[PDB]
Amino acid sequence: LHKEPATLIKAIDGDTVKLMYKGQPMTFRLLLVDVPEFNEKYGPEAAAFTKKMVENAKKIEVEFDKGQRTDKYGRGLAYIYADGKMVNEALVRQGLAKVAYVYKGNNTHEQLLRKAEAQAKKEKLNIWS
Numbered sequence: 001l002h003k004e005p006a007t008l009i010k011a012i013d014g015d016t017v018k019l020m021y022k023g024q025p026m027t028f029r030l031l032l033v034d035v036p037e038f039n040e041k042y043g044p045e046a047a048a049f050t051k052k053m054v055e056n057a058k059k060i061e062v063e064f065d066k067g068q069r070t071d072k073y074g075r076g077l078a079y080i081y082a083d084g085k086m087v088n089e090a091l092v093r094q095g096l097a098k099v100a101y102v103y104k105g106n107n108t109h110e111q112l113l114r115k116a117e118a119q120a121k122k123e124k125l126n127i128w129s
């Protein structure tokens with residue numbers, strides 16, 4: 001896998017962000033995760049977490065997997081990195097997301113996230129509380 005540059009356009013919610021990629025605007029959906037809806041418990045906090053992570057970053061990178069790069073809604077599907085830290089993984093580690101939507105061909109970082117989820121659960125963090 002390889003990291004490509006992008007710049008924040010706008011935070012959206014816990015697992016979507018508007019990014020400029022190769023000069024075009026696009027909504028990215030975070031691979032391998034599911035966060036509560038804004039109206040559901042921990043939904044606001046998930047959004048606030050992702051927002052801070054991406055807004056504070058000096059450098060946002062996008063990392064496509066080996067399979068589908070766009071979903072049925074036209075959203076990009078990627079691992080997003082904020083100053084070299086993976087947002088997908090961070091949310092899961094904080095118990096602000098669950099591992100989810102694991103499809104074959106787009107699951108390189110599955111075991112990594114599951115490990116983070118194992119440790120979030122062990123600590124009864126956020127959704128595991």
Ligand SMILES: Cc1cn([C@H]2C[C@H](OP(=O)(O)O)[C@@H](COP(=O)(O)O)O2)c(=O)[nH]c1=O
Nearest residue numbers: 029030031032033034071072077100101106
């Ligand atoms: C994460 C992810 C979601 N999706 C689709 C599945 C869901 O379809 P349905 O809307 O038909 O349920 C939807 C969930 O996204 P949200 O969790 O952002 O709503 O996004 C993909 O197709 N690929 C993926 O890698």
Ligand SMILES: [Ca+2]
Nearest residue numbers: 015034035036
């Ligand atoms: Ca969601």
